[PDB]
Amino acid sequence: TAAAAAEHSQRELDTVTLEDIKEHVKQLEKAVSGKEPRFVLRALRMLPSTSRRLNHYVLYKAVQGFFTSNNATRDFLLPFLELPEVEAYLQLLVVIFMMNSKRYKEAQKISDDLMQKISTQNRRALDLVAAKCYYYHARVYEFLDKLDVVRSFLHARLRTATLRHDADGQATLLNLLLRNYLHYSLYDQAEKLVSKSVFPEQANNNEWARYLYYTGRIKAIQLEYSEARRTMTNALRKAPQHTAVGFKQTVHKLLIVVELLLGEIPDRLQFRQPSLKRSLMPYFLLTQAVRTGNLAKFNQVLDQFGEKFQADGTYTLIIRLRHNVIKTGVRMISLSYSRISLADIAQKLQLDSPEDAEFIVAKAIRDGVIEASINHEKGYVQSKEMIDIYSTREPQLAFHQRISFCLDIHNMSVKAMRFPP
Amino acid sequence: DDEFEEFPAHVWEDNWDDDNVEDDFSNQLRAELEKH
Amino acid sequence: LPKNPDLRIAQLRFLLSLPEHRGDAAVRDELMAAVRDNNMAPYYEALCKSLDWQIDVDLLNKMKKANEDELKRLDEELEDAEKNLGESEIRDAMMAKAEYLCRIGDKEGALTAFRKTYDKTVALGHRLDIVFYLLRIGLFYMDNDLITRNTEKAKSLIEEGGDWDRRNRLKVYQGLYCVAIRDFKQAAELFLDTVSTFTSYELMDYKTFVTYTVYVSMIALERPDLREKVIKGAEILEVLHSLPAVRQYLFSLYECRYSVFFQSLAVVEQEMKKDWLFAPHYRYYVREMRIHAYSQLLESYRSLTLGYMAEAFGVGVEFIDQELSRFIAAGRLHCKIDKVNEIVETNRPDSKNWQYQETIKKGDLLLNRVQKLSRVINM
């Protein structure tokens, strides 16, 4: 009876998990029955691991021992399975169940019913549950590879979430809508929407991260590389620490490409770190090729790992690479030199003639990646004599940004010191 | 908090220099002395 | 302490493994001489399989027979001690068993036997002796995990009540491991704190130890400390009388004679490539010493004519141009070249300016951390 004993221990753990679900419910009533805001996040933060521990027989007993007011809609869950917020929480749990069970028809129907319910009820403490429902409904449609009807659905829902001055639902809907645009490769509608929507200044860390990823990708494709790099780097700094391996991988990949485009060389600690090595190795080879300026090795790497690039989505940035590869050469040359002559850039940048040198270096300056002058009366490319930047307003400005930031955190921290009674 | 499920997933602090050179500083210096 | 095994065995194996010295008649003769003398049957089999050698059955059979007989007598004596004698001799029999296992090179057998002996034993001294044997086996087979594990083990045992001879021996072991993992700062610290007390003649000769101390010190120490502790050093300068090629290398850099410094750096490179503990570090050592030399020269200049600097370094103008470009790009040096009129200006940052940049960087790190903290906990 080893199987029976294992089932017994698992069901004791299941009683523990049911107690955890009851505690989450109780927190939700602390919020809504207490009517105080928030605390739905408190009851919700354990959603991922709880989804992990979900169990079919456990939910079979749950959908018969829960729902004190048995509105008879429980029979839309019971057959497939074999309050104003707790019902949404339970429904989200059930759609999670079908999700991990790979049952994406009743999953979509039950998600639709959940959406009808949340849309009908015009609550203000239910917006967070609505946000999570939006995300998982999108994921259902994603495993079902429509991604299209969800566009209009989520887009109207975003309209509602921004009419009601909501933050969490607004951010999550904006994020999922951007994901849909990017999955269909509509980097013009995506850009227009990002331009004419304002992200909640007070938004979850996990949503800031995703928004920053998508915005950085939009700008990267749009050829605004400096802000693209800033956005991706900030997204990474915003990202979770002990999780989201895939998200970190994708942000890192795009950041490597964007930096290489700006003309820099990434940091090697990335390719070092164990959670990424296997993911980013193709970019390891690509960075070697770009740093060397070896177009032959670059072509080899493209022909050898091109499929992964077309998979993650980089395959135009990695030709804009070629361009910024010659740019990277000129940036190194102008980083360690002060008066290099053109006939000497031709060679050390692998060019043909001083005329081509003139054109390429002039364009590099125009793009503002080398910051030098040029003189063809004698043919040299003198840089800018560095001025001692402490008798200048640059320290002023830098410390101004940093002091403003510190003051802002003091403000936000002294705020949010809520006292209960 | 939430694992972003929508996204599928030496001991030496190396810092580049893994280039391809005619040895690091032996044949280079030999040829240098030879041509000087 | 005994040689379990001669790390010269590892030196010989790696020297043969290196492609340049694969066909070394002498090296091969000496390696096989040691193999036959100490009867390392599993190690010899591994050598043959790895290096694609034609086995000599006529002697390999005798070697296997000798190993089998010795192991049989050892474990028979161990059983006799178990059935007749107490722990004080059962432990010694097990120790002899493990010692023969390591001396024959059966890695798995030696590790198992030493683990069992450590489980049995209670005396601190012999616990440390077993731990040292394990560290040296780990060093022999370059198993970073095993070496580090027994390393914290040994630190714990010595902290739990130890003695200074084993402190010095552990320090030298830590230094060799630091050289392995390219932590030359700790390597220099330990080596210079235990150069006056070299007692571990099993790992390497004292000439080799002083040479390693000089090398690591030059790569990891500032000029003040180098003068105080490696040129004004009693023993570290006593042995350099017997070592003429290393004294020149050190004193070239200190006296600011630089052409001799590159000559000796090429010498040191070709030496360390052949070496087995520095082999995956010679590119880095050479590059970092080159950067140290260039920075030392330019630390007392503001516009150094490229021709003069080439003459000082005993090279040409093109070579200097190429390598300075490389190092400035890497960001190590503080110097900007001007090739039209060949002049290498030096844009070193003033004290205030450098302090500003450090404040910006470190404050940026702290700001990132606090920003994460606040954003996380406020909401």
Q: How many CA atoms lie within 13 A of A392 on its CB side?
A: 9
Chain B: give the shortest CA distance to residue A232, in Å.
Answer: 16
Task: Say whether A268 and B14 touch across the interface (CB within 8 A).
Answer: yes
Chain B: give the shortest CA distance to residue A247, in Å.
Answer: 6
Angle, helix A127-143 to helix A168-183, in steps of 10 degrees: 20
First to last CA, chain C: 62
Can you tell me which residue has the tokens 């999780």? A243
Instruction: Residue C270: list chain B partners with CB under 8 A.
Output: 26
Both tokens assigned to A182: 């990017």
Both tokens assigned to C294: 């260039």
DSSP of A156-175, one letter per residue?
A: HHHHHHHHTT-SHHHHHHHH
Note the helical H segments in chain C: 7-17, 25-38, 41-51, 57-84, 87-104, 107-120, 124-140, 144-159, 164-180, 184-193, 206-220, 223-226, 234-242, 244-255, 259-274, 282-298, 306-313, 317-330, 351-378
CB C180 within 8 A of CB C10: no
Beta-carbon contacts of residue C285 (< 8 Å; ≥ 6 apart): C215, C219, C268, C269, C272, C278
A328 shares its domain with A390: no
Choose among C338, C347, C368: nearest Cβ to A339: C338
Instruction: Residue B29: list chain C partners with CB under 8 A.
Output: 262-263, 266, 315
A301 shares its domain with A400: no
Q: How many CA atoms lie within 13 A of C58 on its CB side?
A: 0
C-alpha distance from residue A168 to each of A175, A299, C318 (Å): 11, 45, 62
Beta-carbon contacts of residue A110 (< 8 Å; ≥ 6 apart): A76, A77, A80, A91, A94, A95, A98
* CA atoms B19, B20, B21, B24: torsion sign: positive
Beta-carbon contacts of residue C1 (< 8 Å; ≥ 6 apart): C129, C132, C169, C200, C202
Hey, is the C-beta of C269 within 8 angstroms of any chain B C-beta?
A: yes
Strand order through the sheet with C303-305: C303-305, C343-345, C336-338
A329 shares its domain with A403: no
A217 shares its domain with A337: yes
- Find out whether the peptide bond into A200 is cis, omega within 30 degrees of 0: no
Task: Say whether C339 and A339 touch across the interface (CB within 8 A).
Answer: yes
Both tokens assigned to C66: 């000798």
What is the b/e burial string over A362-393, where b = at least 16 CB atoms within 10 angstroms of the residue's CB? Answer: eebbeeebbebebeeeeebbbbeeeeeeeeee
Task: Say whether A268 and B16 touch across the interface (CB within 8 A).
Answer: yes
What is the b/e burial string over A322-339, where b = at least 16 CB atoms within 10 angstroms of the residue's CB? Answer: eebbbbbbbbbbbbbbbb
**Which region holds residue C53: left if phi is over 0, alpha if psi is between -120 and 50, else beta?**
beta
- Angle, alpha carbons A266-A267-A269 (nearest 5°): 145
- 3-state per-residue secondary structure call for C130-145: HHHHHHHHHHHCCCHH
Radius of gyration of chain C (CA): 26
Choose among B3, B16, B19: nearest Cβ to A244: B3
Task: Say whether C336 and A406 touch across the interface (CB within 8 A).
Answer: no
CB A370 within 8 A of CB A331: yes
A336 shares its domain with A413: no
Domain housing A272: 213-342
A337 shares its domain with A387: no
- Angle, alpha carbons C89-C95-C100 (nearest 5°): 130
Residue A305, amino acid = F
A333 shares its domain with A404: no
Determined by: cryo-EM
Hey, is the C-beta of B17 within 8 angstroms of any chain C C-beta?
A: yes
A311 shares its domain with A410: no
Task: Say whether A48 and B13 touch across the interface (CB within 8 A).
Answer: no
C-alpha distance from residue A5 to each of A2, A12, A15, A62, C294 (Å): 5, 11, 15, 22, 73
d(CA A302, CA A98): 40
A392 shares its domain with A317: no
Specify the DSSP element, H or E, that contains C336: strand C336-338
A289 shares its domain with A393: no
d(CA C155, CA C132): 11
Can you tell me which residue has the tokens 């002060």? A338
Hey, is the C-beta of C368 within 8 angstroms of any chain A C-beta?
A: yes
- Which among C318, C324, C374, C376 is the top mutation candidate for probing chain A, defined by the most A β-carbons within 10 Å of its own β-carbon? C374
Hey, is the C-beta of B22 within 8 angstroms of any chain C C-beta?
A: no
Structural resolution in Å: 3.3
* Strand C336-338, strand C343-345: pairing: antiparallel
d(CA A318, CA A315): 5
Name the burial class of residue C15, with classes exposed (0-12), middle (13-18) and buried (19+) by CB atoms within 10 angstroms of its CB. Answer: buried
d(CA C344, CA C361): 28
Task: Say whether C266 and B29 touch across the interface (CB within 8 A).
Answer: yes
Count other Cβ atoms within 10 Å, centred on residue B13.
11
Both tokens assigned to A256: 């490597």
Instruction: Tell me which residue of C114, C168, C124 sits closest to C146, measured CA to CA.
Output: C114
A334 shares its domain with A389: no
Can you tell me which residue has the tokens 């199987």? A3
Helix, coil or strand: residue A55:
coil
A252 shares its domain with A305: yes
